């Protein structure tokens, strides 16, 4: 009785996913009501329908396709909720893309997912509850295929973020991380939260979680830069005009947007927002690691935020800190290695 393993990292910014055949998908965590659209990649054209027990077919665009719409799942103003309509569509769209076409009668889907470090205790059951209740057919209308998502209880496993990304053997060299009596830190800078997780290495090269030197920062993530640039845009505009989410996201890539025949350059505020977010995250990490900061052998930052802020984040200890090889799929790969050896 085999089982197929799909690792899915759920974010308030980007859904990341990878099954045990090393097929990865990633797309923005925005959905949108769908419509008859009337070597293109499927990930940029997610027109989809979801069938349930009520025989509701709910129609959605999700990902890049939904990003390019007037109506949107909020990005800034998406209330934090672990089981919602949008996390169900986003979870079922990531599954739908990572489920093969010829699974045997014996092979069933095993999902590995989780919560941020300190969010785990609070929301392990609510996430295990939404997964238990999955009873949906996900239909990719423009791509002639559909999948059924049903979860066998404890055909699913939940892991707090942090351990998996660290322990990994594809994005790390765990031979060089196993040093006696030293620490190893992770700084996963995400969209709404930021995880700081450290592990003490035993004298027998066994790693131990240090809850004390670890937190989940609830007010610091890349969303701070989005809001500061949203206010910088209306403020600079002095028109009372606001961007939509496709524009605001572009305005936070480089700080340039072409709006109503005006070249809006806010790169000066974007740089300041990134230094200001990065300062806080370095301060919190220093706050948790006192003089024990000298006892580290690596401090690896990761996530989408870690990728864009690495040059600021590195200042926390420049000759010792590094960027993990695939920052955004760093927890999702940890979720694969942990689920597969299970
Ligand atoms: N090329 C890029 N330029 C600027 N920002 C980026 C880029 N790629 C990703 N990001 C930022 O990183 C975020 C993705 O973070 P992610 O690793 O998904 O964390 P979470 O798991 O909390 O969603 C996006 O919302 C975006 O703001
Ligand atoms: Mg994340
Ligand atoms: Mg906290």
Residue numbers in the entry: 1 to 38, 46 to 349
What do the authors of the reporting publication say about this deposited model?
Functional ParMRC plasmid segregation systems comprise an actin-like polymerizing motor (ParM), a centromere-like specific DNA sequence (parC), and an adaptor protein (ParR), which attaches a plasmid, via the parC, to each end of the growing ParM filament or filament bundle. Thus, the force generated from ParM polymerization is harnessed for plasmid segregation. Here we investigated the ParMRC cassette from pCBH, a 257 kb plasmid that carries the botulinum neurotoxin type B. This ParMRC cassette is also found on other C. botulinum plasmids, such as pCLK (267 kb) and pRSJ2_3 (245 kb), which encode neurotoxin types A and F, respectively. Despite the similarities to actin, pCBH ParM is a genuine ParM, since it has a closed β-barrel, a feature that is missing from actin and MreB structures.
Using the E. coli R1 ParM cryoEM protofilament structure as a template, we designed a quadruple mutant of pCBH ParM that was predicted to prevent polymerization. Mutations to subdomain 2 (F42D, I46D) and subdomain 3 (S298D and R299D) were expected to disrupt intra-protofilament subunit contacts, with subdomains 1 and 4. X-ray crystallography studies on the quadruple mutant, using the cryoEM density map as a molecular replacement model, led to the 3.25 Å structure of the monomer (G-ParM), which was subsequently used as a guide to construct the filament protomer structure in the cryoEM density (F-ParM). Two of the mutation sites (Phe42 and Arg299), from the quadruple mutant, were observed to participate in intra-protofilament subunit contacts. This accounts for the success of the quadruple mutant in the preventing filament formation and allowing for monomer crystallization. The major difference between the monomer and filament protomers was the folding of a disordered region into a helix in F-ParM (F helix). This region is equivalent to the DNase I binding loop in actin, which is generally disordered in G-actin and becomes ordered to form a defined extended loop in F-actin. The nucleotide-binding site in the pCBH G-ParM and F-ParM structures contain ADP and the magnesium ion is coordinated by Asp9, Asp195, and Gln168 equivalent to Asp11, Asp154, and Gln137 in actin, suggesting a common mechanism of ATP hydrolysis in which Gln168 (Gln137) directs the hydrolytic water towards the ATP γ-phosphate for nucleophilic attack. Actin residue His161, which has also been proposed to be the catalytic base in ATP hydrolysis, is not conserved in the pCBH ParM structure and has the opposite charge, Asp202, indicating that the conserved glutamine may represent the evolutionary conserved residue important for hydrolysis.
